[PDB]
C-alpha cells in the first residue's frame, strides 16, 4: 500500500519502499522531472496497523536538503498517516528546520502540511 | 558531535550514529532504564553544515512506536538542529501522528518540543 | 450472579459471561476507560456451587497480556470465589508469569490479590 | 510447541491446543488412565513470545473441578511458561481456591507448583 510513488499537490514526488521491518527508504524529488532535485528519504511506519477498537497507518520520514547539487542546511520531517482504498492518500504535517545561529533559533522551524496521492493530473507533452 | 547518546528533559534517551553520508541510525528509549521501551530510529542530518553567510546543524528523525512489546499505532518525527560546544544540545520540535479513522483524522497529530542534551542529572543508586 | 462487569480496587475492569457449561468468557481492561488496554479473558467456574455440608462459588480465569497494542510477554491467572448478595464480591489471588530466560526463571512469577466488586466510586465528569 | 500432551510429576496429564489467537483449549486428567478424572481446561498464552532484549512463553489456564463424576467446588489456575527444546517443559505455579463460607475464606486457597513435561517414565503392562 505505501510502497511506490507519491505526489504532493505542489510539484514534488517521492518513491518509497516500505520494508517488512517498519523501514521506509527512498528518494524525494522536490521538483517533478528535475534530476538535480532528488534527496535521500528515510523513515518508519506502523507495520501492523490493525486494531480491535479502518484506521490509517502511522508513518514519518525525514529528508535532509543536501545532495550533490544543493545544500539548504535544513531538513524536513513529515508526520502523517496512510489511508488506502480507491483514493489512497498520505496525509501529513511537516516541520522544516534550518541550521541557525543561536540568536535566530526562534525562527529556525517552519510548519506546513502536504497531502500525497498516488496520482496527479498528467498530460501528454 | 551528533553521534552518541542524548537525553530529553522527560526521561527519554536515544543513541544515534551520524554516518558520513547524512544518515542517522539508532534506537530511542522512551523510558530511561526500560529495556522494553526501545524502538528503531532513523533520520538524516546536514553533513556539511558550514556557511559563509556558527550555525546549528539541521537534522530530523522518525520513531514508529512499534516494537516487540508495544504498538501505539503512531509515529513521532523530530525536526531540529544540533548545537555543539560545552552545552551541546539538539533543539527539536516534534509531531506525533496516530492512525485514525477518517472521522477522527482532524485530531490525529500532536505537536510538542524536546530539548536533548548530552548529560542529565544522575546519581548513584 | 457472576455474569457482568467487575472492578478491582486499582482501576481495572472486566466483563464476563458465565455460561451454563462452566465457561467464563470476556474481556479484561487493565485501565478503566482505556480502549487500548483490553485483553481476552477465559476461565472456568463451579456451575453447581450448592453443598449440604452459603459457600462461595469457585472460579478462575487467565489473561495473556497480548493485544493489538501491547505484548507484555506475560499472563496473569486469578483464582478465587464469587460471593453474592448485597455486597457481591469476587475475592482472588493472582499469579503473573513473564517469559524469562532460564537463568531468570526463579524470578518469573509475581503474586498478589485483587478484590472485585460490582460497583466502584463513580462521579460525573 | 505447546499443543499436545503434558504430564506433571504426580500422575496427572492434560491435552491442549494452542490456537493462533492465543487460546488454550483442552482437557485435564487428574489421574492418568482414569476416564472419570477428566475436566475442561481453558487458558491463554503469549502467541508472539520473541523479544529483542531465548525467553519462555508465558501462559496460564484454569480447571474448575466439576465434571459428570465429581464436583470439588473448587478451581485451579496454573501460571507459568513454556520452554521448548530437547527437554521441553511447562514450569508452573498454581492456586486452588475452594468455595467457602465467609468465616473460612482465609483458608480458601492453596498454592503449589507443577512441572509439566512431554514425556514421563512409561512401561509395558
> Grid coordinates representing A21?
521491518
Which string of b and e fits B29-56 if b means at least 16 CB within 10 Å? Answer: bbeeeeebbbbbbbbbbbbebeeeeebb
Rg (CA), chain B: 16
Residue D1 to chain B, least CA–CA distance (Å)? 20
Q: Is residue C117 a contact partner of residue C88, using CB atoms and an 8 Å limit?
A: yes
Longest distance between any two alpha carbons in chain B, whole Å: 50
> Grid coordinates representing C25?
468468557
Interface test with C, best of D1, D75, D113, D114 (most C CBs within 10 A): D75
DSSP assigned state of B36: T
Record: contact D58-C64, CB cut-off 8 A:
yes
Record: contact D51-B68, CB cut-off 8 A:
yes
Which string of b and e fits A33-55 if b means at least 16 CB within 10 Å? Answer: eeeebbbbbbbbbbbebeeeeeb
> Grid coordinates representing C50?
450448592
Q: Is residue A117 a contact partner of residue A4, using CB atoms and an 8 Å limit?
A: no
Helix (H, G, I), strand (E, B) or coil at D104: helix
Question: Of how many residues is chain D composed?
Answer: 125
> Grid coordinates representing C108?
518469573
Residue A33 to chain B, least CA–CA distance (Å)? 23
Residues of chain C with Cβ-Cβ distance to A52 below 8 Å are: 38, 67-68
Helix (H, G, I), strand (E, B) or coil at D46: coil
Q: Is residue D74 a contact partner of residue D96, using CB atoms and an 8 Å limit?
A: yes
Q: Is residue B22 a contact partner of residue A66, using CB atoms and an 8 Å limit?
A: yes
* The dihedral sign for the CA sequence C107, C109, C115, C117: positive
> Grid coordinates representing B21?
553520508
Helix (H, G, I), strand (E, B) or coil at A102: helix
Please classify residue A58 by burial: count the beta carbons closer than 10 Å to its beta carbon, then call 0-12 exposed, 13-18 middle and 19+ buried: buried
Is A7 part of any known ligand binding site? no
Question: Of how many residues is chain B composed?
Answer: 125
Q: What are phi and psi of C59, to 5 degrees?
A: -160, 170
Distance from C-alpha of A88 to C-alpha of A19, rounded to nearest angstrom: 19
Q: How far is CA A9 from the centre of its chain?
A: 12
Tally Cβ neighbours within 10 Å of residue C101: 11
Helix (H, G, I), strand (E, B) or coil at A80: strand
Record: contact A44-B57, CB cut-off 8 A:
no
Q: Is residue B26 a contact partner of residue B3, using CB atoms and an 8 Å limit?
A: no
Q: What are phi and psi of D86, to 5 degrees?
A: -65, -35
Query: Which residue's C-alpha cell is 483464582?
Result: C79
Tally Cβ neighbours within 10 Å of residue C7: 20
Of the candidates D80, D83, D116, which has an alpha carbon nearest to the alpha carbon of residue D95? D80
**Could you tell me which residues of D are annotated as the binding site?**
28, 39, 78, 94, 106
Is B45 part of any known ligand binding site? no
Distance from C-alpha of D122 to C-alpha of D125, rounded to nearest angstrom: 9
Q: Is residue A111 a contact partner of residue A94, using CB atoms and an 8 Å limit?
A: yes
Distance from C-alpha of D56 to C-alpha of C74, rounded to nearest angstrom: 10
Of the candidates B80, B44, C105, which has an alpha carbon nearest to the alpha carbon of residue A111? B80
Q: Is residue B15 a contact partner of residue B5, using CB atoms and an 8 Å limit?
A: yes
B32: left (phi over 0), alpha (psi -120 to 50) or beta: beta
Q: Is residue C27 a contact partner of residue C38, using CB atoms and an 8 Å limit?
A: yes
Q: Resolution of the coordinates in A? A: 1.5
Please classify residue A120 by burial: count the beta carbons closer than 10 Å to its beta carbon, then call 0-12 exposed, 13-18 middle and 19+ buried: middle
Q: Is residue A46 a contact partner of residue B66, using CB atoms and an 8 Å limit?
A: yes
Distance from C-alpha of D88 to C-alpha of B78, rounded to nearest angstrom: 46
Q: What are phi and psi of B98, to 5 degrees?
A: -105, 145
Domain that holds residue B21: 1-125
Distance from C-alpha of D46 to C-alpha of C111, rounded to nearest angstrom: 19
Residues of chain C with Cβ-Cβ distance to D76 below 8 Å are: 60, 79
Record: contact C23-D44, CB cut-off 8 A:
no
Query: Which residue's C-alpha cell is 523513515?
Result: A43
Distance from C-alpha of D18 to C-alpha of C92, rounded to nearest angstrom: 26
Distance from C-alpha of B103 to C-alpha of C28, rounded to nearest angstrom: 27
Q: Does A54 touch chain C (CB under 8 A)?
A: no
The chains found to touch B (3+ Cβ pairs under 8 angstroms) are A, C, D
Is A78 part of any known ligand binding site? yes
Q: Does B33 touch chain D (CB under 8 A)?
A: no
Longest distance between any two alpha carbons in chain C, whole Å: 50
Q: Does C66 touch chain D (CB under 8 A)?
A: yes
Q: Does C95 touch chain D (CB under 8 A)?
A: yes
D112: β partners: D94
Helix (H, G, I), strand (E, B) or coil at A104: helix
- How was this model experimentally determined? X-ray
Distance from C-alpha of A37 to C-alpha of D28, rounded to nearest angstrom: 68
Of the candidates D90, D94, D124, D106, which has an alpha carbon nearest to the alpha carbon of residue D8? D90
CATH of the domain at C55: 2.40.128.30
Please classify residue D92 by burial: count the beta carbons closer than 10 Å to its beta carbon, then call 0-12 exposed, 13-18 middle and 19+ buried: buried
**How many domains is chain A built from?**
1
Q: How far is CA B26 from the centre of its chain?
A: 10
Q: Does C37 touch chain D (CB under 8 A)?
A: no
Chain A residue with CA closest to B102: the answer is A55
Query: Which residue's C-alpha cell is 475436566?
Result: D39
Q: Is residue C44 a contact partner of residue C16, using CB atoms and an 8 Å limit?
A: no
Record: contact C71-B68, CB cut-off 8 A:
yes
C15: β partners: C5, C27
Count B/D contacts: CB-CB distance under 8 Å.
12
- Could you tell me the CA-to-CA distances from C84 to B65, C2, C57, C93, D71 in Å, in that order? 44, 8, 9, 18, 20
Q: Is residue C116 a contact partner of residue C89, using CB atoms and an 8 Å limit?
A: yes
Distance from C-alpha of D50 to C-alpha of B22, rounded to nearest angstrom: 32
Residue C117 contacts by C-beta under 8 Å, 6 or more apart in sequence?
A: C6, C7, C9, C87, C88, C89, C90
* The dihedral sign for the CA sequence A125, A40, A42, A99: negative
Instruction: Print the SS3 string covering chain C.
Output: CCCEEEECCCCCEEEEEECCCCEEEEEEECCCCCCCCEEEEEEEECCCCCCCCCCCEEEEEEEEEECCCEEEEEEEEEEEEEECCCCCEEEEEEEEEECCCHHHHHHCEEEEEEEEECCCCCCCC
Amino acid at each position: 500500500g505505501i510502497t511506490g510513488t507519491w505526489y504532493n499537490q505542489l510539484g514534488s514526488t517521492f518513491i518509497v519502499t516500505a520494508g517488512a521491518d517498519g523501514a521506509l527508504t527512498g528518494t524525494y524529488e522536490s521538483a517533478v522531472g528535475n534530476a538535480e532535485s532528488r534527496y535521500v528519504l528515510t523513515g518508519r511506519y506502523d507495520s501492523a496497523p490493525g486494531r480491535g477498537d479502518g484506521s490509517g497507518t502511522a508513518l514519518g520520514w525525514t529528508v535532509a536538503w543536501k545532495n550533490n547539487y544543493r545544500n539548504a542546511h535544513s531538513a524536513t520531517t513529515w508526520s502523517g498517516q496512510y489511508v488506502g482504498g480507491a483514493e489512497a492518500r498520505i496525509n501529513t504535517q511537516w516541520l522544516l528546520t534550518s541550521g541557525t545561529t543561536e540568536a535566530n533559533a526562534w525562527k529556525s522551524t517552519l510548519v506546513g502540511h502536504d497531502t500525497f496521492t498516488k496520482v496527479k493530473p498528467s498530460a501528454a507533452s
